[PDB]
Structures are given as C-alpha cells and as structure tokens.
C-alpha cells in the first residue's frame, strides 16, 4: 500500500511510524525499536599508543551495492596505495597550526596523482602518518585530526560584512598545506576544542612522536572528483605549544606521510589537473 | 650424478644425450624423443578476415614461475588496458612504409604512459588495430607486421664504412612513428619479403580495411624497461602501392589503434621519461 | 532512439531540418573534429530534440547509461572511420583526437 | 566529440559530403526522479 521511500529505508534501524499516504517519507518520525607496510613503503608506529581507525571503519573498496558508476574502476593497489611523504612543516613555538586537504595533497604526486588526474572519479581511504620527532626534553602537543569536509571560512573582511571566500591556494593548498590563520576556530568558525569528535590523535611529545590516523573514504557519494572535492582536511595543530630550552634542537619538523588506502579510480579521460 | 643445468632443462622436450661430466650442459646435442572492447574503448573488426594472435599466444599476465622481481606488480587493468589511437599516417602513392616501436608509442600517452614512466619494469602484450579505410575503387596492400626486437640499422654512411647508429628519434620515434627510408631491408638489412614469419596481417584494400594483430609480451625477460627496451616494432608497409583514379579520395589515412593487453608494471619510483 | 540535434547551429526556419544531421566530409586525414555535444540529456542544447531530453525536462534527476546511435547516411561506396569519444566529466573539450 | 579516425574516403561518383544522424536514447538502467515542470518548452503566446 506504500512506497518504501523514506530516508531511513536502507538503514538497519526499525521504525514504528504512523503514515496515511502511500509514501513512507510522509510518515511520522516515530520512534525506534610495529612496521606498517603498504605498497613499496614502510613506516614505524612503535610510539603512537595505537593507530586511530577513522570512525572505526577500515578503508574498504567501494561496495557494489554502494557504487553507481557502471565503468570498471581501476585499482592500482601498490603503485598508488603506498606511503607518500609530503614536505615537512617546522613546528615552532609560534606555530599556529596547519591543514592538508585530501586527496589534494596527493593529486600531484606519484601514480596516485596521475590516476587522480586521468580519472574523473576517485575513491580512497587514507592511512595518515603524522610524525614529529622531539627529544625527551622537548614538550608540546599536537592535535592531529581528520576533519571531514573541512570547508575553510574566511575572516569575512575581519568585520564580517565582506562575503569573502578562501582562494584556491587556501581551499586546496596541495602537498605543502596551509597554515591556520585562526586555529581556534579552525579557519571555519568551528572550535578546535571540539575537533576531537573527528578522527584524531595526539602527538604528545613526552608520550608519542607520531600519529597514525587511518581514514576511510567519507562522502555522500561512492566516488568523487579528486581535483574539485576534498573529502577531508587533516589538521595538525599545536594545542600545547612547543617548548624547549636553548641548546635543544629548535628545528622540530612535522612530516606528513600519507597512504591512500584502497584507491579506486573511475571515469578515465585525459589528465586534468583541476 | 649430474647437475640438471643444460639450456633445455626447463623445456618440455626430452633429449637422449651422452654426457661424461656432472654438468648437463657438457652433454652432447643428442636427438629428441565484431566489436572488440577493452577498457573504455571499442574498435570494429568486421573486415579483417581474422584477428592475428602473435605466435598463437594470448597476452597473459606474468607467470609466477616466470617472474623474477619480488615486488608486487601493479595491474591497472582498465585505465592502461584499452585502445590507444595514435596520430594517422597518410598512405600515399609514394609511401615507403612506417614503423612504430613498442611500447615507445605509448610511454607518453594515458595512464599507461604514466605507469611506464613511474615504473622501472613493464610487461604487456598488445592488441594492435591498424586500420586503413579506402573505397572499393582504391587499391593497394599493406603488410601490417610485428617485428620483435626491431633493431634499426643505418645506411652506414651509404658506402658501408661509417659505423653509424640510428638516433633516438629513429630507434624510438614515439607515437608518431618513423618512416622506412629503405622498406625493402626494413632499415635493418633484413628483407621485408620474409617479414611474414613475424606476426603479420595484410590490409588488402579490396579485402579488408583493418588489421588486428594481437601481440603477446615477447622478451627474454619477464619484465623490462618500457623506456629503454622496445619489445617489438609494428611495421605498416605498402607492399602493393596505393592506387586510385583522380577524383577518388587521395587522403588515405592509416590509423594505429593500440591496446596494451594485460599490462604489468613493477619497480615503482619517480616518473622517468627516458 | 530519437534524433539528437548535434547540428544545432541552423536556427533558420528553412534550415531546421539541417539540425537533425551533420556533415562528415573528406578531410586532410588528421584526427579532425567532426562534431561535439555535451552528454547531458536534460541540458539546453542538442539533447532537447530527443524524447529522452524532453522527458528529462519533466524530471529533476536522472541516472543510468545513455545510448547515442550514430547513423551514417552516406553512400554505400563511402567509407571511413570515426572516433566517437565520450569524455568523462572532468575532461575539457579535447584539443586533439 | 566526433573525430575522423581515418577520413571520409569516397570514390569517384559518390558524394564528397555525407551526413550522420545521431539517434540518442537511454539504456534500460536509466531512471528519472523528482518529477518537475519542464523548462525545455516555455509557452509565450497565450492559447486562444
């Protein structure tokens, strides 16, 4: 008598609702009822205290129930699924924080960058190794965090009247990344104090030198453009500032090492950079 | 009593030999006892009278008994295994013939070109569609042939005293290809009359407009460099010259359409063009 | 299969039947560009001539594969090969074949 | 995009220009949803 067409039809949750129409969406809300290796690459995760799996979900390939694109996607599986090391960011005493957009960091690097450029569609999760070596006499903490759909906001002219939008070097800063001008609101008006509801790991220098967050592919879509859409933003921010006495190593680098996990590329055409 | 170490040990042929040493190689010689689709691409082979499989061997992937490289090779399987169309060559009345070196034609094209550049090792066979449309009032024949390890020779200064070697634009002419300066000796001192012992197909214009030679990977090695080593040379030569009356289409193009078949790339490093 | 007006250049009323077909002619033998159209059925352009495209006017969202049948209407003696390339959405207009 | 893969090759006596009729349709996996008013035909003159 009724189209099974509410928003929770495909979900695993039973709903006792009231309906009077042939559309299930017309119904009531109702109530219910250590060496890591990938590719030709190897990292070390002895001092991280665990590896964070983003939302408890391993980066699987696209489910055939879940995909829409009828073209056979390519899975290069070693040549693109491998640790990619970006250029280092120097953690300083005045380091506000940096972000990296994904897979915008890797659309210009490796066969992953070519597969991102040559294919319209892209799907991968990510093993993100953020490492920061410091001595036992250095101190400071990094919130290494994965903010999905990290839409950058502007200062809006500072006052708030100008409707600015962040430039392409800011929304998609590539493998270099972009600093946080305002890490407290994450350049997005949302507090970094609540950033740990996102997949996060602390680089507390006394405790661990590296953070390994393993991120699944997070989208409303089974695949997307690797060039336009950035599925998430990795945020590496000094919540506790870097401190050391003079004589200790002042150059404290944060190296960002990225494994695309189960990369899947569909819609092959010419190589397009953006 | 004897090392099994002759050159025919791994072969399927039994040899009754005489030996007096512990090496089997020391022994005597003895005596014994229509739409083709790959990737996102489709060709038409209605007028070819068959498809030539090179040496009766389909381009399989590398056998695990046959491989040596311990790194896991990537098989992109759709994004590189697909028909690649080169720029056309105009068959003329004075066309001597052209050649194309493999996979040198495709080291700069597609994800195959990137996988050839990013990987030291390469292995693929080839589905080679050579097509030449001409009317029922045009005439001429092409020997479309696959000469494996097509080493180009020079004119040796013409007289024979100069020890010339062909330049890189001649040994590896890319997707454009190189004409035959002397098609009778195939620019190699070997007769084109005997070129049909190699995998060959005739484009006899009255009979067929296209030639589809399917070439396996032919090497002494399971993999090789796609940049240095060219596994074979495709030769498209007008044995019978193109002829037509004035008024018929003088522009008779030969389009070269190439499918790498079961491409396998190992030894991932930076993208190297040569 | 309804006629796709790939040749949606002649707005002239005497030339509106020229919109239903487009001129393959003898070329210089390169990969010359014959015709170009977006593959969007509901878009303002060549697909509005189709029944698919006009029914796509009545719906917001569409999914599924599209067929475009290209029918050569030259002579039996006319021969030749076309590369009909669907470009996935990221690619711009290809400069070459 | 349509590209000349070889060329339009014609003999004497047959026309040097031909025509392609493109016939576009949808496959059996095609669907539509969110039934809306059409913009592909706007009425301008009032129907008397």
């Amino acid at each position: 008598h009724e189209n099974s067409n509410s928003a929770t039809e495909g979900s695993t949750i039973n709903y006792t609702t009231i309906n009077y129409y042939k559309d299930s969406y017309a119904a009531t809300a109702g109530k219910q009822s250590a060496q890591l290796t990938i590719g030709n690459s190897t990292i070390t995760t002895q001092e991280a205290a665990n590896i964070i799996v983003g939302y408890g979900e391993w980066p699987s390939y696209c489910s055939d129930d879940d995909a829409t694109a009828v073209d056979k996607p390519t899975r290069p599986d070693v040549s693109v699924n491998r640790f990619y090391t970006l250029d280092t960011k120097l953690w300083e005493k005045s380091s506000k924080g940096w972000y990296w957009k994904f897979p915008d960091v890797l659309t210009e690097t490796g066969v992953f960058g070519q597969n991102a450029q040559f294919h319209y569609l892209y799907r991968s999760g990510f093993c993100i190794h953020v490492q920061c070596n410091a001595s036992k006499f250095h101190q400071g903490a990094l919130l290494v965090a994965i903010l999905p759909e990290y839409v950058i906001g502007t200062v809006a002219g500072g006052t708030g009247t100008e409707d600015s939008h962040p430039p392409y070097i800011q929304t998609q800063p590539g493998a270099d990344g972009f600093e946080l001008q305002h890490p407290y609101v994450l350049d997005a008006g949302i507090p970094i104090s609540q950033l740990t509801v996102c997949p996060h790991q602390w680089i507390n220098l006394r405790t661990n030198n590296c953070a390994t967050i393993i991120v699944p592919y997070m989208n409303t879509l089974p695949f997307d453009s690797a060039l336009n859409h950035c599925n998430f933003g990795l945020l590496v921010v000094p919540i506790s500032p870097l401190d050391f006495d003079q004589g200790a190593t002042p150059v404290i680098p944060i190296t960002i090492t990225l494994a695309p996990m189960c990369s899947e590329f569909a819609g092959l055409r010419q190589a397009v950079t953006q | 009593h004897e090392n099994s170490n002759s050159a025919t040990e791994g072969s399927t042929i039994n040899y009754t030999t005489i030996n007096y040493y512990k090496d089997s190689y020391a022994a005597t010689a003895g005596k014994q006892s229509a739409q083709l689709t790959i990737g996102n691409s489709t060709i038409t082979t209605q007028e070819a009278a068959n498809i030539i499989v090179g040496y009766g061997e389909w381009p399989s992937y590398c056998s695990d008994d046959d491989a040596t490289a311990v790194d896991k090779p990537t098989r992109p399987d759709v994004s590189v295994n697909r028909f690649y169309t080169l720029d056309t060559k105009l068959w003329e009345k004075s066309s001597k013939g052209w050649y194309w070196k493999f996979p040198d034609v495709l080291t700069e094209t597609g994800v195959f070109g990137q996988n050839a550049q990013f990987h030291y090792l390469y292995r693929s066979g080839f589905c080679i569609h050579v097509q030449c449309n001409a009317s029922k009032f045009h005439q001429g024949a092409l020997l479309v042939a696959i000469l494996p390890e097509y080493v180009i020779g020079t004119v040796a200064g013409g007289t024979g005293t100069e020890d010339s070697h062909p330049p890189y634009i001649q040994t590896q002419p890319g997707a454009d290809g190189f004409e035959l300066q002397h098609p009778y000796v195939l620019d190699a001192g070997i007769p084109i009359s005997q070129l049909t012992v190699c995998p060959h197909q005739w484009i006899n214009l009255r009979t067929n407009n296209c030639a589809t030679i399917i070439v396996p990977y032919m090497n002494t090695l399971p993999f090789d460099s796609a940049l240095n080593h060219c596994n074979f040379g495709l030769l498209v030569v007008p044995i019978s010259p193109l002829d037509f009356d004035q008024g018929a289409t003088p522009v008779i193009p030969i389009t070269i359409t190439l499918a790498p078949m079961c491409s396998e790339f190992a030894g991932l490093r930076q993208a190297v063009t040569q | 299969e309804t006629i796709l007006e790939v040749n949606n250049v002649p707005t002239n009323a005497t030339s509106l039947m020229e919109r239903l077909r487009f001129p393959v002619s003898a070329q210089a033998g390169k990969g010359e560009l014959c015709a170009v159209f977006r593959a969007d059925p509901g878009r303002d352009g060549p697909w509005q001539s189709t029944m698919l495209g006009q029914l796509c006017g009545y719906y917001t969202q569409w999914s599924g594969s599209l067929e475009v049948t290209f029918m050569f209407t030259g002579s039996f003696m006319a021969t030749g090969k076309m590369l009909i390339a669907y470009t996935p959405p990221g690619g711009p207009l290809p400069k070459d074949r | 995009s349509i590209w000349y893969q070889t060329n339009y090759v014609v003999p004497i006596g047959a026309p040097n220009t031909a025509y392609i009729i493109a016939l576009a349709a949808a496959q059996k996996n095609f669907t539509m949803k969110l039934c809306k008013d059409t913009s592909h035909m706007l009425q301008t003159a009032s129907i008397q």
């Binding site: 055939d64 995909a67 073209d71 056979k72 | 996102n40 | - | 496959q27 996996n29 669907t31």
Partner: peptide, 18 residues
C-alpha cells in the same frame, strides 16, 4: 545494445526505482 558490449563494466547493484 549493452554497456559491456561497449566498455569494461563493474557490477552495479542498481536499486533505482522507476
């Protein structure tokens, strides 16, 4: 006409309503 008569095709378990 079909789509793996045309390209390489993946299994799409398509629940799109008509």
């Amino acid at each position: 006409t079909s789509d793996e008569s045309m390209i390489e095709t993946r299994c799409v378990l398509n629940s799109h309503s008509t």
